[PDB]
Short mmCIF file of C-alpha atoms in Angstrom, two decimals:
data_model
loop_
_atom_site.label_atom_id
_atom_site.label_comp_id
_atom_site.label_asym_id
_atom_site.label_seq_id
_atom_site.Cartn_x
_atom_site.Cartn_y
_atom_site.Cartn_z
CA UNK A 254 -8.34 -9.96 9.00
CA UNK A 255 -5.01 -8.91 7.57
CA UNK A 256 -1.94 -10.48 6.00
CA UNK A 257 1.68 -9.36 5.65
CA UNK A 258 4.36 -11.10 3.58
CA UNK A 259 7.88 -10.22 2.59
CA UNK A 260 8.64 -10.05 -1.12
CA UNK A 261 12.20 -10.69 -2.30
CA UNK A 262 14.00 -9.84 -5.57
CA UNK A 263 14.81 -12.94 -7.63
CA UNK A 264 18.21 -11.61 -8.71
CA UNK A 265 20.64 -8.72 -8.40
CA UNK A 266 18.74 -6.61 -10.95
CA UNK A 267 15.29 -6.79 -9.31
CA UNK A 268 13.96 -8.49 -12.45
CA UNK A 269 10.98 -9.72 -10.43
CA UNK A 270 9.95 -10.35 -6.84
CA UNK A 271 8.81 -13.57 -5.18
CA UNK A 272 6.53 -13.93 -2.18
CA UNK A 273 5.97 -17.19 -0.30
CA UNK A 274 2.43 -18.56 -0.49
CA UNK A 275 0.99 -21.52 1.42
CA UNK A 276 -1.23 -23.82 -0.65
CA UNK A 277 -3.14 -26.84 0.56
CA UNK A 278 -3.22 -29.01 3.66
CA UNK A 279 -0.61 -29.64 4.92
CA UNK A 280 0.80 -26.42 3.51
CA UNK A 281 2.91 -26.54 0.37
CA UNK A 282 4.89 -23.30 0.19
CA UNK A 283 5.56 -21.95 -3.29
CA UNK A 284 7.28 -18.68 -4.19
CA UNK A 285 4.92 -16.75 -6.43
CA UNK A 286 5.27 -13.60 -8.50
CA UNK A 287 2.55 -11.23 -7.31
CA UNK A 288 1.27 -9.53 -10.46
CA UNK A 289 -1.08 -6.56 -10.32
CA UNK A 290 -1.26 -6.74 -14.14
CA UNK A 291 -2.97 -10.13 -14.36
CA UNK A 292 -5.67 -12.11 -12.58
CA UNK A 293 -4.74 -15.80 -12.54
CA UNK A 294 -3.14 -17.65 -9.62
CA UNK A 295 -1.25 -20.45 -11.36
CA UNK A 296 1.48 -22.78 -10.21
CA UNK A 297 4.02 -25.27 -11.40
CA UNK A 298 2.59 -28.61 -10.36
CA UNK A 299 2.78 -32.38 -10.45
CA UNK A 300 0.84 -32.05 -13.72
CA UNK A 301 3.39 -29.81 -15.46
CA UNK A 302 5.10 -31.45 -18.45
CA UNK A 303 8.26 -32.88 -16.91
CA UNK A 304 10.66 -31.40 -19.49
CA UNK A 305 9.24 -27.94 -18.71
CA UNK A 306 10.11 -28.10 -15.01
CA UNK A 307 13.70 -27.06 -14.13
CA UNK A 308 14.18 -26.41 -10.42
CA UNK A 309 10.79 -24.94 -9.48
CA UNK A 310 8.88 -26.08 -6.45
CA UNK A 311 5.68 -27.81 -7.53
CA UNK A 312 2.18 -28.01 -6.07
CA UNK A 313 0.95 -31.61 -5.81
CA UNK A 314 -2.82 -31.50 -5.34
CA UNK A 315 -3.04 -35.22 -4.56
CA UNK A 316 -1.04 -34.54 -1.36
CA UNK A 317 -3.47 -31.85 -0.18
CA UNK A 318 -6.52 -33.03 1.77
CA UNK A 319 -8.35 -29.80 0.93
CA UNK A 320 -7.69 -29.83 -2.84
CA UNK A 321 -10.65 -30.47 -5.10
CA UNK A 322 -10.60 -30.66 -8.89
CA UNK A 323 -12.76 -27.91 -10.37
CA UNK A 324 -14.46 -30.15 -12.86
CA UNK A 325 -14.25 -29.13 -16.48
CA UNK A 326 -12.30 -25.95 -15.81
CA UNK A 327 -9.27 -25.02 -17.89
CA UNK A 328 -7.12 -21.93 -18.23
CA UNK A 329 -4.68 -20.44 -20.70
CA UNK A 330 -2.87 -17.14 -20.49
CA UNK A 331 -0.47 -15.15 -22.63
CA UNK A 332 1.48 -12.30 -21.08
CA UNK A 333 2.69 -9.04 -22.61
CA UNK A 334 6.21 -10.39 -23.04
CA UNK A 335 4.94 -13.31 -25.10
CA UNK A 336 5.28 -15.88 -22.32
CA UNK A 337 2.39 -18.26 -21.64
CA UNK A 338 1.02 -21.14 -19.59
CA UNK A 339 -2.11 -23.29 -19.42
CA UNK A 340 -3.70 -26.17 -17.56
CA UNK A 341 -6.57 -27.24 -15.32
CA UNK A 342 -7.90 -25.99 -11.99
CA UNK A 343 -8.23 -27.02 -8.37
CA UNK A 344 -9.77 -25.20 -5.46
CA UNK A 345 -7.73 -25.26 -2.25
CA UNK A 346 -6.81 -23.25 0.81
CA UNK A 347 -4.34 -20.45 0.10
CA UNK A 348 -2.62 -18.30 2.72
CA UNK A 349 -0.44 -15.24 2.24
CA UNK A 350 1.33 -13.76 5.22
CA UNK A 351 -1.21 -15.16 7.67
CA UNK A 352 -4.31 -14.29 5.60
CA UNK A 353 -6.25 -17.39 4.55
CA UNK A 354 -8.73 -17.90 1.72
CA UNK A 355 -10.61 -21.17 1.43
CA UNK A 356 -11.84 -22.36 -1.96
CA UNK A 357 -9.31 -20.33 -3.93
CA UNK A 358 -8.92 -21.31 -7.57
CA UNK A 359 -5.39 -22.68 -7.93
CA UNK A 360 -4.61 -23.07 -11.62
CA UNK A 361 -2.33 -26.03 -12.18
CA UNK A 362 0.03 -25.73 -15.13
CA UNK A 363 0.15 -28.55 -17.63
CA UNK A 364 2.27 -26.44 -20.00
CA UNK A 365 4.53 -23.44 -19.52
CA UNK A 366 6.59 -21.50 -22.05
CA UNK A 367 10.37 -21.53 -22.06
CA UNK A 368 10.86 -18.30 -20.12
CA UNK A 369 9.00 -19.81 -17.17
CA UNK A 370 10.95 -23.07 -17.32
CA UNK A 371 14.23 -21.16 -17.50
CA UNK A 372 13.46 -19.18 -14.34
CA UNK A 373 13.96 -21.60 -11.46
CA UNK A 374 13.09 -18.99 -8.84
CA UNK A 375 9.44 -18.41 -9.80
CA UNK A 376 7.00 -21.20 -8.93
CA UNK A 377 3.98 -19.43 -10.43
CA UNK A 378 2.01 -16.18 -10.43
CA UNK A 379 -0.55 -14.68 -8.10
CA UNK A 380 -2.70 -12.22 -10.02
CA UNK A 381 -3.93 -9.05 -8.34
CA UNK A 382 -5.62 -7.22 -11.22
CA UNK A 383 -9.42 -7.33 -11.53
CA UNK A 384 -11.15 -10.70 -11.72
CA UNK A 385 -12.70 -9.78 -15.08
CA UNK A 386 -9.31 -10.70 -16.61
CA UNK A 387 -9.20 -14.19 -15.09
CA UNK A 388 -8.83 -16.78 -17.86
CA UNK A 389 -10.57 -19.81 -16.30
CA UNK A 390 -13.21 -21.29 -18.58
CA UNK A 391 -16.12 -21.95 -18.62
CA UNK A 392 -16.57 -20.37 -15.18
CA UNK A 393 -14.32 -17.37 -14.52
CA UNK A 394 -12.67 -17.40 -11.10
CA UNK A 395 -11.87 -14.72 -8.55
CA UNK A 396 -8.44 -13.48 -7.52
CA UNK A 397 -7.04 -14.08 -4.07
CA UNK A 398 -7.69 -10.42 -3.21
CA UNK A 399 -11.25 -10.53 -4.50
CA UNK A 400 -11.94 -13.64 -2.38
CA UNK A 401 -10.30 -12.13 0.70
CA UNK A 402 -11.75 -8.65 0.40
CA UNK A 403 -14.90 -8.95 2.48
CA UNK A 404 -12.94 -10.45 5.38
CA UNK A 405 -10.22 -7.79 5.36
CA UNK A 406 -10.18 -4.98 7.92
CA UNK A 407 -10.06 -2.58 4.94
CA UNK A 408 -10.52 -3.62 1.28
CA UNK A 409 -6.95 -2.78 0.26
CA UNK A 410 -3.55 -4.23 -0.40
CA UNK A 411 -0.23 -2.40 -0.56
CA UNK A 412 2.98 -2.96 -2.49
CA UNK A 413 6.26 -1.79 -0.99
CA UNK A 414 8.91 -3.14 -3.33
CA UNK A 415 12.57 -2.75 -2.42
CA UNK A 416 15.48 -1.56 -4.49
CA UNK A 417 18.02 -4.37 -4.35
CA UNK A 418 16.35 -5.40 -1.09
CA UNK A 419 13.27 -7.20 0.21
CA UNK A 420 9.96 -5.39 0.60
CA UNK A 421 6.41 -6.14 1.67
CA UNK A 422 2.91 -6.92 0.43
CA UNK A 423 0.24 -6.15 3.03
CA UNK A 424 -3.44 -7.07 2.81
CA UNK A 425 -6.20 -5.31 4.68
CA UNK A 426 -4.31 -2.44 6.30
CA UNK A 427 -2.06 0.52 5.56
CA UNK A 428 1.22 0.51 7.51
CA UNK A 429 1.58 4.19 8.34
CA UNK A 430 5.24 3.61 9.33
CA UNK A 431 6.17 2.39 5.85
CA UNK A 432 6.10 5.72 4.00
CA UNK A 433 7.01 9.38 4.43
CA UNK A 434 4.66 12.33 4.07
CA UNK A 435 1.12 11.65 2.87
CA UNK A 436 -0.45 9.20 0.43
CA UNK A 437 -1.90 10.86 -2.67
CA UNK A 438 -4.84 9.02 -4.14
CA UNK A 439 -5.78 9.06 -7.79
CA UNK A 440 -8.66 7.69 -9.88
CA UNK A 441 -8.63 4.22 -11.42
CA UNK A 442 -10.40 2.93 -14.50
CA UNK A 443 -11.19 -0.78 -14.37
CA UNK A 444 -12.51 -0.83 -17.96
CA UNK A 445 -9.57 -2.91 -19.22
CA UNK A 446 -9.31 -5.00 -16.03
CA UNK A 447 -6.14 -3.24 -14.86
CA UNK A 448 -5.19 -0.78 -12.13
CA UNK A 449 -5.23 1.93 -14.78
CA UNK A 450 -4.62 5.54 -13.79
CA UNK A 451 -3.38 8.85 -15.24
CA UNK A 452 -0.09 10.36 -14.16
CA UNK A 453 0.02 14.16 -14.25
CA UNK A 454 3.45 14.43 -15.87
CA UNK A 455 7.17 13.96 -15.49
CA UNK A 456 10.58 15.51 -14.99
CA UNK A 457 14.06 14.35 -15.97
CA UNK A 458 16.75 14.85 -13.36
CA UNK A 459 16.67 18.37 -11.95
CA UNK A 460 14.69 19.59 -14.97
CA UNK A 461 11.37 21.36 -14.94
CA UNK A 462 8.22 19.33 -14.52
CA UNK A 463 6.19 18.77 -17.69
CA UNK A 464 2.46 18.69 -17.02
CA UNK A 465 0.95 16.10 -19.31
CA UNK A 466 -1.54 13.28 -18.82
CA UNK A 467 -0.01 9.81 -19.08
CA UNK A 468 -2.51 6.95 -18.85
CA UNK A 469 -0.95 3.69 -17.72
CA UNK A 470 -1.20 0.65 -15.47
CA UNK A 471 0.34 -0.10 -12.09
CA UNK A 472 1.91 -3.47 -12.85
CA UNK A 473 4.09 -5.24 -10.31
CA UNK A 474 4.62 -8.10 -12.76
CA UNK A 475 6.47 -5.94 -15.28
CA UNK A 476 10.12 -5.13 -14.53
CA UNK A 477 10.57 -1.81 -16.33
CA UNK A 478 8.88 1.55 -16.81
CA UNK A 479 7.30 1.81 -20.29
CA UNK A 480 6.26 5.32 -21.34
CA UNK A 481 5.49 7.22 -24.56
CA UNK A 482 8.40 7.57 -26.98
CA UNK A 483 8.50 11.36 -26.52
CA UNK A 484 8.99 11.01 -22.74
CA UNK A 485 11.56 8.24 -23.08
CA UNK A 486 13.57 10.16 -25.70
CA UNK A 487 13.65 13.19 -23.38
CA UNK A 488 15.03 11.02 -20.59
CA UNK A 489 17.79 9.28 -22.56
CA UNK A 490 18.84 12.51 -24.27
CA UNK A 491 20.29 13.49 -20.87
CA UNK A 492 22.64 10.48 -20.86
CA UNK A 493 25.76 10.84 -23.01
CA UNK A 494 26.06 7.98 -25.46
CA UNK A 495 22.59 6.55 -24.86
CA UNK A 496 20.79 5.27 -27.93
CA UNK A 497 17.88 3.10 -28.97
CA UNK A 498 19.17 -0.20 -30.30
CA UNK A 499 16.83 -2.25 -32.47
CA UNK A 500 19.23 -5.22 -32.20
CA UNK A 501 19.20 -5.17 -28.39
CA UNK A 502 15.52 -4.23 -28.19
CA UNK A 503 15.52 -0.85 -26.49
CA UNK A 504 17.56 2.00 -25.10
CA UNK A 505 21.08 1.17 -24.01
CA UNK A 506 23.64 3.41 -22.42
CA UNK A 507 27.33 3.35 -21.49
CA UNK A 508 27.78 1.43 -18.25
CA UNK A 509 30.16 4.23 -17.16
CA UNK A 510 27.25 6.71 -17.05
CA UNK A 511 25.68 8.26 -13.99
CA UNK A 512 21.95 8.21 -14.69
CA UNK A 513 19.61 11.10 -13.88
CA UNK A 514 16.52 10.56 -11.78
CA UNK A 515 13.04 10.44 -13.28
CA UNK A 516 10.05 12.01 -11.56
CA UNK A 517 6.41 11.12 -12.24
CA UNK A 518 3.33 12.99 -11.09
CA UNK A 519 0.50 11.64 -8.98
CA UNK A 520 -1.98 14.48 -8.80
CA UNK A 521 -0.03 17.39 -7.37
CA UNK A 522 2.44 14.98 -5.74
CA UNK A 523 5.72 13.75 -7.18
CA UNK A 524 7.48 10.37 -7.00
CA UNK A 525 11.22 10.43 -7.68
CA UNK A 526 12.88 7.37 -9.21
CA UNK A 527 16.63 7.60 -8.44
CA UNK A 528 18.95 7.19 -11.42
CA UNK A 529 20.43 3.97 -10.07
CA UNK A 530 16.97 2.32 -10.25
CA UNK A 531 17.09 2.80 -14.03
CA UNK A 532 20.30 0.75 -14.50
CA UNK A 533 19.63 -2.84 -15.62
CA UNK A 534 23.26 -3.69 -16.15
CA UNK A 535 25.26 -5.11 -19.04
CA UNK A 536 23.27 -6.27 -22.04
CA UNK A 537 25.36 -9.45 -22.01
CA UNK A 538 27.98 -10.64 -19.54
CA UNK A 539 31.09 -8.43 -19.69
CA UNK A 540 29.58 -5.82 -22.01
CA UNK A 541 30.09 -2.11 -21.35
CA UNK A 542 26.68 -1.38 -22.88
CA UNK A 543 23.98 -1.35 -20.20
CA UNK A 544 20.23 -1.80 -20.58
CA UNK A 545 17.92 1.06 -19.61
CA UNK A 546 15.08 0.77 -17.13
CA UNK A 547 12.87 3.28 -18.91
CA UNK A 548 11.74 2.10 -22.34
CA UNK A 549 9.21 3.09 -24.97
CA UNK A 550 5.68 1.72 -24.77
CA UNK A 551 5.16 2.35 -28.48
CA UNK A 552 3.71 -0.84 -29.91
CA UNK A 553 2.79 -2.27 -26.49
CA UNK A 554 -0.41 -0.29 -26.74
CA UNK A 555 -0.39 0.83 -23.10
CA UNK A 556 1.98 2.63 -20.74
CA UNK A 557 3.21 0.47 -17.88
CA UNK A 558 4.31 1.67 -14.45
CA UNK A 559 6.29 -1.46 -13.67
CA UNK A 560 8.66 -2.25 -10.84
CA UNK A 561 11.15 0.52 -11.73
CA UNK A 562 8.44 3.07 -10.92
CA UNK A 563 6.55 1.24 -8.20
CA UNK A 564 9.60 0.42 -6.07
CA UNK A 565 10.20 4.17 -5.65
CA UNK A 566 6.87 4.40 -3.81
CA UNK A 567 4.58 2.93 -1.21
CA UNK A 568 1.57 1.97 -3.34
CA UNK A 569 -2.01 1.43 -2.14
CA UNK A 570 -4.32 -0.68 -4.26
CA UNK A 571 -7.69 0.39 -2.90
CA UNK A 572 -10.38 -2.13 -3.81
CA UNK A 573 -13.32 -0.21 -2.39
CA UNK A 574 -16.53 -0.08 -4.45
CA UNK A 575 -14.90 2.66 -6.51
CA UNK A 576 -11.25 1.57 -6.68
CA UNK A 577 -8.40 4.08 -6.42
CA UNK A 578 -4.59 4.00 -6.26
CA UNK A 579 -2.46 5.75 -3.67
CA UNK A 580 1.20 6.68 -3.89
CA UNK A 581 3.55 7.92 -1.18
CA UNK A 582 7.27 8.54 -1.09
CA UNK A 583 9.25 6.34 1.31
#
């Protein structure tokens, strides 16, 4: 089997992407944030504290003839940005782009943190990291991909995120029309539960490539590119007036700037992030100070190849017995 679904930016900055997902019978379609950096599929629901729901579409398990309470199971997750959610668990039928999994754990939110409430466009998350990170207790549950894998034509999914435009998540096949040149594959460590890999270096603008190993995660659920402070300083040094602002919480730059590109290495291959992808707009409405899309990972504890990086590529998440990641230009 295969599936193919369009993923759409939630706003004009590509802060996140939503993908429609069918849950239950009859289908209830929710727009979920596909997150290769986590492993829980959780939704706003009829059980979510009423004051914490503000415009989201909710899953109502009582209206699904295939929903079953997973007795005794609870979940609770805290994300890197300090957001969080928790609740109980149903199993139900879940379909993405024509690909159906029966008995998928659908984690129903009883509580969500303010950032989730305040984002009316995201109805929940669909985790695509390794199932070892799934938070369901006392019986850990599998991700949608893990459940689907054996049925897929090939045990892969691909992320093709757009810049200020829709893109695509495919399951079970590689669309050879969706990228240019060849796909370069690179090793993955699953030791931390993430799609963790080692970039071979970077360049800033038209500058020379610096060969250096940068271990990080491919994380579709993180907006920005978080890299070591040395790398980030080298980038922003090429932008007149750019500075790190502790009050704002990262590098800012004059909105009048033209940003240089940033290149990262995948083996001997190179992915170029155009300068415009690195512009996250005014820090507050009407400000001429703009927020940078490349930020320091210092004090996160891990480097993160988030959407800023991934949307410059066609990315293969290869879930074969030994997982790997592939990157192609597009």
